């Protein structure tokens, strides 16, 4: 008898994805994006979507293929240059999509919220601030029933859950179960998106057998076990053109040709006909002889 | 004395972490980073600081330089610093009103805005908890107005007495290239504390959209000590990385 | 210039707290306790606790000295033989203590909340069952603002913080400014603990340079850091009977040898003698002793 | 056949955990322990099981016995597990009503007990929050009492129905040492669905203070397997330990 091997295809896990389902991605802006699913996702289509994330070029390239309906996110940024993913800010200056923007921490906790299976969890940041106004009734407060000290109670944001249909995460290793591991110096929140959601997809730069990936790694690092898994892809590369860890720096060159590519209709129609428009094995030939000039 | 603008801004910046103590200093551009570290090697040691990727220095380093680490800060453990109001953040903003509401997330209307940025990022949950600062390298009245577009840091006239989930509010300084200033003012408004030497009260008031409380008193910046100026000059910003953010 | 040298003797740290205090003692059960900094509590006069725990022979000791006037704890176990610690059980038996006691889950939560500085957080835990009635009136319930998608509001405990006058915790390395680290399996809690508190002792089996502790233990190990520690106190065999991560296990010979000696007055009174009534150091000459028979 | 007490037992409590699926196993007793390893041998591979301290096991090891890893789950861990709900505990008991109200805490009065034990530990969470199965050793009317003393586990009818908090609950098996029984009798109570052979209706009667549903019509613990018994015998409890916790 043998445990679920869950091995399958970039498409085949966005095969397993709807229209209008509320997707998490994992990494963080430009980091550890599992941006091979997001090209596979690109293929597809699949639209109408609500996409939770610490938004990077994940979200910018749903935005250039109008697949975004509402982001709940607590910034989007490539961290490096040209830092403003222009494609959000296209979508958005297009009033295309609808914004739950929240403060950083309130997206941790909103997982952490649907992780646990609560309708909320309490929090300060985001009071007094305009977050309020980006989800007017859709963010209420919540009481204390303990008065503080001195008497008077405090009330909260009752940060609500973020449940997802769906998580898109990419990690360094893992087994064909869905044991998984980060390395380097941040997890970011993989785990919690992947616990928050109903259908967790997991791509990884190698799979390896179980006892080889946790004799590589500290027990630290483990952050994925198999509850929270449903596929592995095999994705080497799979964060490009985001960092990976110590897999791999950002191809900070090619980050730049994305966010020029953007620019131009005649730009982009070549960057998506030269790109994302075959395979991920054709994009990452594509990649490697843009490398070479 | 050949003191310049960029370092008068430096010891400013310094001067924003007088008597933190044990807490994170959490600089979110250059020369708020020059000042943290210049606090840290003379009068506050014991502040924590980052790589500003996930991992705190135990020696304070030369900007964009490695140090030996102490600990361990990745995302996830920042947000629990947050929490805790062990940090004083100093950040950038586009736009500062008079109550201390600043933007940093996009102009215009909020669902379609004109311009985009990079969202609110840690500005709500950074105001709410704990010591906030603020940098400006080039002071002008657009960024100094009356009404900011989107209020991602929360200004003083945003908080409920009544509601103890306000306590922790407190804006310590904005430090721009023409001088320092607080929301010590009456009603918490933008004060003068000092104006940087060369500054005139005339250009602070051209270049500011409200009235600066205290504006016609304020003293000039005072002078680096020699040691700071050699820490400044040797130790941590050799390469006059200073000088690019500081307009005038 | 130079940071804060915390290191302090165990008498040192003991003579920080006063009677009437909450403490929060790190580890669980027969595992990781701060046994030395416990020895040193009770050879003072510092009375009349509130202590929150995952109780072991921590809160025995402390019950046998008449230390204990309430009591937060999720269990209380030896672990091993004889599992039940004869104090604890003297001590509820004879009401000499208030208990609120707490399923395992709500301890972590309410350290959760008050290192967070939040009143509460809402937990499934408790519902339905007697921790309702070890609290009465302490603990009270929060109803969700937003409504499930039934249409009905969950209405779940409201764990209050468990706010900390002090914590006392045992790590295996540490250095004189309180950045430190387990080693081993399970940090246990000992990071909420100091998190939850106001003054904070850890004890170290070793003092190390900082540079020491960071190449000796992965990044993920460093679970305190200088802003979560008061006082550093270098107790070798700190942890003493209890297990101690990577550097012993337990005593298990000497933890029945404490557990026979409550059930006299005469096996108690040798044992108080013999093992409570001089130094740390002393102590330690009299356990290596009964070890050689 | 010459299967013992002890082995209908073990194979009970691999019955437990039948469409389990991809779960945490949680057993807290020697016999649940081989019950839920046989069952990851046999018909739920998927089960998550760790070493009782820290480690998810990869392989499936005897009783007392290491194995090759595949996870991480120290405590502060497993409290995410029961509040995801992805697990099924087996727990003892001391006290168990007619609706699955069980005390594993202490006999007596809350505030100064008769007899102390550990306290509810994780009875209240593990209730609330995934299916919870339920091993006594010595079934007897002690055990399976009209009150228990402390509710450390939720029984069915402290569940109010308009509050989804209480959705989770669930009270799977109660497997003993005489049968296998569950609370789906009328109003949620307990009753037989198996007795183990040599168990007389009686013998189940006599040993329990309350009446029990379907006593009367309950057929006879399934044979193990030949599969099972060789599992039973030689790979996972070679050394017997499974029949000092089993009382006739």
């Given at each position: 008898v043998s445990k679920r091997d869950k091995r399958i295809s970039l498409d085949d896990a966005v095969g397993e994805l709807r229209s209008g389902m509320t997707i998490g991605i994992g990494g963080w802006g430009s980091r550890r994006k599992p941006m091979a699913l997001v090209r596979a996702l690109l293929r597809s289509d699949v639209t109408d979507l609500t996409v939770v994330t610490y938004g990077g070029p994940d979200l910018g390239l749903l935005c250039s293929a109008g697949k975004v309906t509402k982001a709940y996110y607590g910034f989007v940024s490539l961290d490096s240059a040209p830092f403003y993913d222009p494609w959000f800010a296209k979508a958005r200056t297009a009033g295309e999509i609808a914004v739950?923007?929240?403060?950083?921490?309130?997206?941790?906790?909103?997982?952490?919220?649907?992780?646990?299976?609560?309708?909320?969890?309490?929090?300060?940041?985001?009071?007094?601030?305009?977050?309020?106004?980006?989800?007017?009734d859709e963010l209420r407060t919540v009481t204390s029933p303990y008065p503080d000290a001195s008497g008077k109670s405090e009330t909260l944001i009752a940060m609500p859950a973020l449940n997802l249909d769906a998580a898109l995460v990419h990690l360094n290793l893992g087994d064909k179960h869905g044991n998984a591991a980060y390395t380097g110096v941040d997890p970011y929140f993989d785990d919690l998106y992947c616990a928050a959601a109903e259908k967790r997809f997991v791509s990884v730069?190698?799979?390896?057998?179980?006892?080889?990936?946790?004799?590589?790694?500290?027990?630290?690092?483990?952050?994925?076990?198999?509850?929270?898994?449903?596929?592995?892809?095999?994705?080497?590369?799979?964060?490009?053109?985001?960092?990976?860890?110590?897999?791999?720096?950002?191809?900070?060159?090619?980050?730049?040709?994305?966010?020029?590519?953007?620019?131009?209709?005649?730009?982009?129609?070549?960057?998506?006909?030269?790109?994302?428009?075959?395979?991920?094995?054709?994009?990452?030939?594509?990649?490697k002889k843009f490398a070479e000039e | 004395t050949e003191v310049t603008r960029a370092e008068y801004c430096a010891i400013a910046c310094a001067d924003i972490f007088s008597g933190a103590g044990e807490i994170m200093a959490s600089p979110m551009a250059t020369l708020p980073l020059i000042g943290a570290r210049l606090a840290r090697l003379t009068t506050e040691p014991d502040l924590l600081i980052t790589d500003g990727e996930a991992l705190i220095f135990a020696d304070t380093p030369a900007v964009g330089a490695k140090a030996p680490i102490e600990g361990w800060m990745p995302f996830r453990k920042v947000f629990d610093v947050v929490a805790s109001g062990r940090r004083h953040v100093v950040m950038g903003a586009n736009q500062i009103d008079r109550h201390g509401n600043q933007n940093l997330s996009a102009f215009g209307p909020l669902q379609q805005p004109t311009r985009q940025m990079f969202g609110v990022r840690g500005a709500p949950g950074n105001t709410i908890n704990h010591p906030t600062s603020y940098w400006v390298g080039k002071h002008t009245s657009r960024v100094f107005?009356?009404?900011?577009?989107?209020?991602?840091?929360?200004?003083?006239?945003?908080?409920?007495?009544?509601?103890?989930?306000?306590?922790?509010?407190?804006?310590?300084?904005?430090?721009?290239?023409?001088?320092?200033?607080?929301?010590?003012?009456?009603?918490?408004?933008?004060?003068?504390?000092?104006?940087?030497?060369?500054?005139?009260?005339?250009?602070?008031?051209?270049?500011?959209?409200?009235?600066?409380?205290?504006?016609?008193?304020?003293?000039?910046?005072?002078?680096?000590?020699?040691?700071?100026?050699?820490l400044i000059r040797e130790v941590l910003d050799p390469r006059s990385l200073r000088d690019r953010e500081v307009s005038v």
């Open positions: 739950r923007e929240m403060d950083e921490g309130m997206v941790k906790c909103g997982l952490e919220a649907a992780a646990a299976r609560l309708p909320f969890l309490p929090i300060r940041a985001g009071l007094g601030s305009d977050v309020r106004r980006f989800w007017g730069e190698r799979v390896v057998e179980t006892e080889e990936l946790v004799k590589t790694v500290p027990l630290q690092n483990l952050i994925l076990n198999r509850m929270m898994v449903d596929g592995v892809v095999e994705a080497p590369n799979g964060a490009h053109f985001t960092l990976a860890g110590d897999s791999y720096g950002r191809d900070e060159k090619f980050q730049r040709h994305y966010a020029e590519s953007a620019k131009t209709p005649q730009a982009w129609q070549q960057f998506v006909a030269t790109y994302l428009s075959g395979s991920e094995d054709d994009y990452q030939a594509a990649v | 107005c009356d009404t900011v577009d989107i209020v991602s840091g929360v200004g003083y006239d945003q908080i409920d007495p009544e509601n103890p989930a306000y306590r922790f509010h407190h804006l310590h300084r904005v430090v721009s290239n023409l001088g320092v200033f607080d929301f010590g003012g009456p009603d918490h408004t933008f004060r003068a504390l000092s104006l940087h030497p060369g500054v005139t009260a005339d250009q602070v008031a051209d270049n500011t959209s409200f009235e600066v409380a205290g504006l016609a008193d304020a003293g000039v910046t005072r002078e680096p000590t020699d040691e700071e100026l050699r």
